Write an enzyme that holds these catalytic residues in place. Structure first.
Site, PDB file in Angstrom:
ATOM      1  N   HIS A  46       0.799  -1.233   0.000  1.00 39.26           N
ATOM      2  CA  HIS A  46       0.000   0.000   0.000  1.00 39.26           C
ATOM      3  C   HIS A  46       0.819   1.263   0.000  1.00 39.26           C
ATOM      4  CE1 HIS A  46      -1.616  -2.889   3.097  1.00 39.26           C
ATOM      5  NE2 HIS A  46      -2.410  -3.112   2.067  1.00 39.26           N
ATOM      6  N   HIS A  48       0.923   4.560   1.967  1.00 38.98           N
ATOM      7  CA  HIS A  48       0.493   5.211   3.197  1.00 38.98           C
ATOM      8  C   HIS A  48       0.503   6.726   3.093  1.00 38.98           C
ATOM      9  CE1 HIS A  48       0.678   1.712   6.081  1.00 38.98           C
ATOM     10  NE2 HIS A  48       0.841   1.226   4.862  1.00 38.98           N
ATOM     11  N   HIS A  63      -3.085   4.088   5.694  1.00 37.64           N
ATOM     12  CA  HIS A  63      -3.229   4.074   4.242  1.00 37.64           C
ATOM     13  C   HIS A  63      -3.691   5.425   3.741  1.00 37.64           C
ATOM     14  CE1 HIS A  63      -3.920  -0.586   4.373  1.00 37.64           C
ATOM     15  NE2 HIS A  63      -2.792  -0.195   4.936  1.00 37.64           N
ATOM     16  N   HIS A  71     -11.004   0.353   4.008  1.00 38.87           N
ATOM     17  CA  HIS A  71     -10.011  -0.432   3.271  1.00 38.87           C
ATOM     18  C   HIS A  71     -10.686  -1.405   2.308  1.00 38.87           C
ATOM     19  CE1 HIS A  71      -6.311  -2.711   2.501  1.00 38.87           C
ATOM     20  NE2 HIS A  71      -7.020  -3.803   2.721  1.00 38.87           N
ATOM     21  N   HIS A  80      -9.265   2.579  -0.119  1.00 43.61           N
ATOM     22  CA  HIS A  80      -8.362   3.665   0.110  1.00 43.61           C
ATOM     23  C   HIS A  80      -7.693   3.946  -1.232  1.00 43.61           C
ATOM     24  CE1 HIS A  80      -8.025   2.060   4.521  1.00 43.61           C
ATOM     25  NE2 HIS A  80      -9.044   2.886   4.399  1.00 43.61           N
ATOM     26  N   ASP A  83      -4.695   1.674  -1.733  1.00 40.42           N
ATOM     27  CA  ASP A  83      -4.856   0.218  -1.668  1.00 40.42           C
ATOM     28  C   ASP A  83      -4.436  -0.442  -2.971  1.00 40.42           C
ATOM     29  OD1 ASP A  83      -5.867   0.234   0.920  1.00 40.42           O
ATOM     30  OD2 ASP A  83      -7.942   0.273   0.307  1.00 40.42           O
ATOM     31  N   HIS A 120       4.115  -5.359   3.340  1.00 47.06           N
ATOM     32  CA  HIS A 120       3.754  -5.941   4.642  1.00 47.06           C
ATOM     33  C   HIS A 120       4.103  -7.428   4.833  1.00 47.06           C
ATOM     34  CE1 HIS A 120       1.278  -2.666   6.386  1.00 47.06           C
ATOM     35  NE2 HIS A 120       1.248  -2.296   5.123  1.00 47.06           N
ATOM     36  N   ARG A 143       5.066  -3.943   9.062  1.00 51.18           N
ATOM     37  CA  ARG A 143       5.636  -3.262   7.913  1.00 51.18           C
ATOM     38  C   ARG A 143       7.063  -3.703   7.750  1.00 51.18           C
ATOM     39  NH1 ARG A 143       2.822   2.704   9.089  1.00 51.18           N
ATOM     40  NH2 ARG A 143       0.767   1.782   9.357  1.00 51.18           N
TER      41      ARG A 143
HETATM   42 CU   LIG Z   1       0.338  -0.816   4.165  1.00 45.09          CU
HETATM   43 ZN   LIG Z   2      -6.256   0.433   2.828  1.00 41.35          ZN
END
Ligand SMILES: [Cu+2]
Ligand SMILES: [Zn+2]
Ligand SMILES: [Cu+2]
Ligand SMILES: [Zn+2]
Lengths: 153, 153
Positions: A46, A48, A63, A71, A80, A83, A120, A143
């Site tokens: 993602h 952020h 995010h 999400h 998001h 995403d 992730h 993360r």
């Molecule tokens: Cu993420």
């Molecule tokens: Zn998200």
């Protein structure tokens, strides 16, 4: 084409280079590159909100979510902006990323320039995991590596 | 107020955190923070064109220069947008940065979001060195540490 790049680094073995290309400002972004040092299988991926690396990947915040939605996966209407879903590492620990996305941009309000790309620990459940966490982070866990998305040549 | 931050790292000991705050778009950007691991004296300090960290500080490219001008000091009309001049390290190797600049911005054409902040080995001669290098880099020498400027809260 506006072009961007994020170099992913973390405290562990995960590292890589992700390229972004957007030839037309009203068209989609192509996302490609390699990430290595990954366990085999699916990893949440993602953009952020913040490009803040002062405390590793933690200070990247949540995010990227300018429209304040829940999400989802990248194919969903309810997602998001940040995403991008999952990337898949092979048995050699390498994810050869190839994504096209029409919600993120390299310009305008949905721009990811100066924001952090994060890979992730676990798979993104795309908001289908039946809890509050699924609806904020996709349960992708911790993360592993991140990188501020920068303007490239 | 938009806010941004750059985390500077290199191969050596030089490292720091630089903050940016711009209360008004078209107002000045305040720049402040701390860089350690420097030799005592003056060190050139610039925003370079690319937020590209794939080959370390080298892939940041030249100074950010959207108006195609010659290198200068931050007080000059003839300068690069990225020309923030020099920062000064005390005898314990620490530069307490405190700068205000109204040529850089955190938005629009002169935005430094997604671009690399770089701190240099030698002093920037502010384009007054009388050689060809002076009008390009200020003879600031090698790049000690750099960081992609990211969006902060
Ligand atoms: Cu993420
Ligand atoms: Zn998200
Ligand atoms: Cu420089
Ligand atoms: Zn310059």
């Amino acid at each position: 084409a506006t072009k961007a790049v994020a170099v992913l680094k973390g405290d562990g073995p995960v590292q890589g280079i992700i390229n972004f290309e957007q030839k037309e400002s009203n068209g989609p972004v192509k996302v490609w590159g390699s990430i290595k040092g990954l366990t085999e299988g699916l990893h949440g991926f993602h953009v952020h909100e913040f490009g803040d690396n002062t405390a590793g990947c933690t200070s990247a915040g949540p995010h990227f979510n300018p429209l304040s939605r829940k999400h989802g996966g990248p194919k969903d209407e309810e997602r998001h902006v940040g995403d991008l879903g999952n990337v898949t590492a092979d048995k050699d620990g390498v994810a050869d990323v190839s994504i096209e996305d029409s919600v993120i941009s390299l310009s305008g309000d949905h721009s990811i320039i100066g924001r952090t790309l994060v890979v992730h620990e676990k798979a993104d459940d795309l908001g289908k995991g039946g809890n509050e966490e699924s609806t904020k982070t996709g349960n992708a866990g911790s993360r592993l590596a991140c990188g501020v998305t920068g303007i490239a040549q």
